[model samples]
Target: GQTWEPLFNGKNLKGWKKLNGKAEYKIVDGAIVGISKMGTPNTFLATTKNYGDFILEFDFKIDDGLNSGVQLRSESKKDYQNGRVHGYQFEIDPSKRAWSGGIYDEARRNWLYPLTLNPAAKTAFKNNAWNKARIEAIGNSIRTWINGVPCANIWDDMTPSGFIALQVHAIGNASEEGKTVSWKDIRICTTDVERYQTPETEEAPERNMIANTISPREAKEGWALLWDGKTNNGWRGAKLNAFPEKGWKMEDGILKVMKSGGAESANGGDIVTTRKYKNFILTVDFKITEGANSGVKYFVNPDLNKGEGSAIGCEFQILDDDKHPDAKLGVKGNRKLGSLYDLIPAPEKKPFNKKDFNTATIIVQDNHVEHWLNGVKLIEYTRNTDMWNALVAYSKYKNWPNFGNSAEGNILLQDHGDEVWFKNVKIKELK
Candidate 1:
């Protein structure tokens, strides 16, 4: 059996150093307490040393309405995000949503393990009571437990070694000031911890499928890889016969469009599938930089708009709604992330983790289409309907006859001249 070592001395901030923001922290009552102060950005107290592949356990009690998390295999390197702390975070949510113990990618890819996947673990958090949490990170697998209930199991190798940190999320309201989250009984084991590892059987097999690669289950279910993880096997430039040489890049299993002065299809232009589909389910994971704008379009006729603008298609808008000007221009928030370009709007209050990758699912069965973001269905409409026709008539796509009603057309990923990333481009043909 591996012996556990204490992480917090419980009398001082001797082993941790403050990083980012201005929230206050101190040792009190044999616990590390973090207090949220108004006007500060998200603050963190990270360990002085780094650890890789370890088991960490801690006890915490957080005040209601104040969000917190513990960082693992995280970093504050100068080259990455300008020394901003970024990596895996074990969430300590106290809101009514009760998503405690979930694994979130802080300042990075967003939610890696949300409680939505395991509804039973949603209730593992005890409000106003100290709760025990466990985290194990070995190889590419990371798992979390809350009060003895398994909460999250995910596989990601973005950060293999980094320091652990405690967070005091920024607050904006005076009413939220002075809210505190306390931690105690923190311990870790860096060796001989494999015995505590959860078997692969306990993971969400379907959701944990390796990116860019179809699993046996997915292959058996008729799912196909849209963009093979290794190359652009099924895609090409919309206007040119070959893949774009300058703007788009595929690396480390992620396909990204480089920035080029915020012009639509101005760099590598748009990339489209050589094969077209009429009725199918398409899913893609996207991550947008600050103020970036892009889109995933279906029923795209790459031949159209050959002059100097974007191709004609029904766009699933991808934008930083809080920073991008386009989000404010489209009628009724139609151009926001997850919206149907200028045709329909996504739910205004839907959960959107701006700094993380958001999953977008497009389902088109005949003329009926639905847009889903994260796991919530946001938009649904029947193409060619009177209502749809009226909305299209007033939109920029009105000039194109029967726009978005094509029986079959290529799928497109737009390069709007801003840095945007995409992965897990998969699809399943529908009857």
Candidate 2:
């Protein structure tokens, strides 16, 4: 026998609270109804309680052409998005696109599980009738089903626990007013649920899998784990044989550098990989706090600059360009976020999310190197060339011999004495 708890009592909005936007919410005939209104932002009827790992089921019906979602493992924290509701949203679309059961990162990372991969599941929605939906969020895995048909299978661990909310997306047109999204039979199972464990067998098309773990496609493409999500097995202090005891922390699959006032390598110091790589593709997902500063450095000679500051290497700067003074200091914005530290400039376009994780990719193929931010190529240059040497001569790395031309060196994550979170640190060596 399965014991499932009811999330809605059906008498009133007893267990749920309205958040953001000015939409109207009420209970009628034992179902929760959300009415859309013009001149308002996205509205949510969220549960007061938070959940971690659980299986959730509900039935929903919506007006034609109205958009809505069920937010799972979601949150409305004080600092994050200024308390805006964000997390994994089970999309409820009724248009020809029909992405009903897909997962979206509401107000954060956008669509994490779009229905483009599962084309058959797009028609699962029954236009004006109540459709059954199920979601299983266990550990780092999230699977969804609509009317008994599996729709999305995502592997993300960024948000593990938060409240469940029903969303009424903002309506800009007056014709969309009075459109209501209705929900009923909301229940959750917290135990004895079958968990999807193996990433190799669970891999599906168009799934944005988790960080620190490689999928079958990535494995076949010669990718390897750089920093295993949970342990410091392949990394160590830049100047020490072992990982640092303080300033750096590993918890819930995230590797974070603790804040110790904004200073370079002032606390816990920089960490470097145990092995060196010559030409490789490195991808890391990092989240920056207010005024934080850090860097992902390659070709790092940990032995050099051992006394006071950061290690000597080419750096992919991670910074809060608006708050950190370093963003304005380097010539031509060379020191800004995603730049090659003081040597080259990444475009000043705001391609980063300060409150959410941003993907930073560094691709190095012998003398040619490229920097990518959020899937956009920001900077590309050839090393050991006249232009590269001339730029190095004008930068702070001028004192170092053949600064950016090292054949092979360790990858370094600078402490920079700031609160910066990193995960999904992975690499794929090239031939």
Candidate 3:
């Protein structure tokens, strides 16, 4: 059996203390309401008690234009930013982004679990209605829900325990100056959390924040780091028996392909897995330099194109579509980022971040294959099909004999002589 305790007295702010901005707070009709103030920083009404592992639930309703959040495992130490509260936050977003119930690292890492990580949770927040929210912070796992919809499955242990706070986000102009957000039925349970936790849901996949390490959930689900981020143990040069000595660098958990005047295979050449994989889910986060051209290749035969250019394979093209001339060289823009390079084009409008890193995911199950960019599926096709061969026939690989038909081949990272950074390379073999 588990016990739940009401956090707020509902009559006054007895067990709470206000910190930061001078946002007005009051108890009205058994709810705590906060009024937004212009020119003021983010205001917090924090709990006097710090909680370590607990399930906290509340009902929240915010005005249309204002933003707010419920901080969890938070702290306001004098040494850190002059005692400004910082830690995990259950985002209360209401605008078009609709990221309510997603986890944000307030005043710290920022957006540990954005809605882009779980788009299904975007619709969980209601625009003009009160929504029921739940946060289960058990061990290193932090999960949240908005209106009973699971969201923000995160794994991180930067902070073990801290205060819980309610935020009245600062506004920019007079339009949002007086907006208000209300919360009620604030409750928490710290006993026997394992027995009282919400059942796990598959809709929100785990976002492991710890660098280059698999979470317990990911480990149990059969995921493993393809690149350990510190060495080249499982990878070797596509054309060489050993990993390339030049043109590749690993530092600070990022594996980078150094620049070499923008010529295919002119730097370190391509690198491939030491072993072949037939059916698997592969994901790698890549950041490109301007006009950079690279690829994540599968079913790669290193001997096919040893005379010139990158190794022969089915490629998930990584190129700066806006800056690289190669983006226009392929039919229908197939050489653009996330595209089935030289075969099928990715979506024209996508969540491509030019300034920061973006994730590339490839799922291969038997003969079926899929390409995903930033959590959105870009292409889906079956191998050796009439349409699949037809696509290959019209592309640059037409001269190659029966391309992409191998039962299994090594996965490759193309070194097209342009600087590109890759990290969090992982794979989960599928049955």
24-131 in candidate 3: lDDT tens per residue?
898889999999987889999999999999999999999987889999999998999998889999999889988898899999988889888778889999987989
TM-score of each: 0.62, 0.64, 0.92
Q: Which candidate is the best by TM-score?
A: 3
Q: For candidate 1, what is the lDDT? A: 0.88
lDDT of 3 at 312: 88
Q: Which candidate wins on lDDT? A: 3
The residue-level lDDT of candidate 2 at 247 comes to 92
Residue-level lDDT tens digits of model 2 in 212-257: 7886567777878888989999999998999998999999889999
| Order of the predicted models by TM-score, top scorer first | 3, 2, 1
Candidate 3, TM-score vs. the true structure? Answer: 0.92
For model 3, the stretches where C-alpha displacement exceeds 4 angstroms are 77-81, 126-129, 176-178, 201-203
- For candidate 3, the clash count comes to 0
Worst 10 residues of 2 by lDDT: 195-204
lDDT assessment of candidate 3: 0.90
Alpha carbon lDDT of residue 396, candidate 1? 88
- In model 1, the worst 10-residue window by lDDT is 200-209
Candidate 1 residue lDDT tens string, 367-427 = 9999999878999999878898899999988899988877798999998999999999999
Residue 390, candidate 3: alpha-carbon lDDT: 87
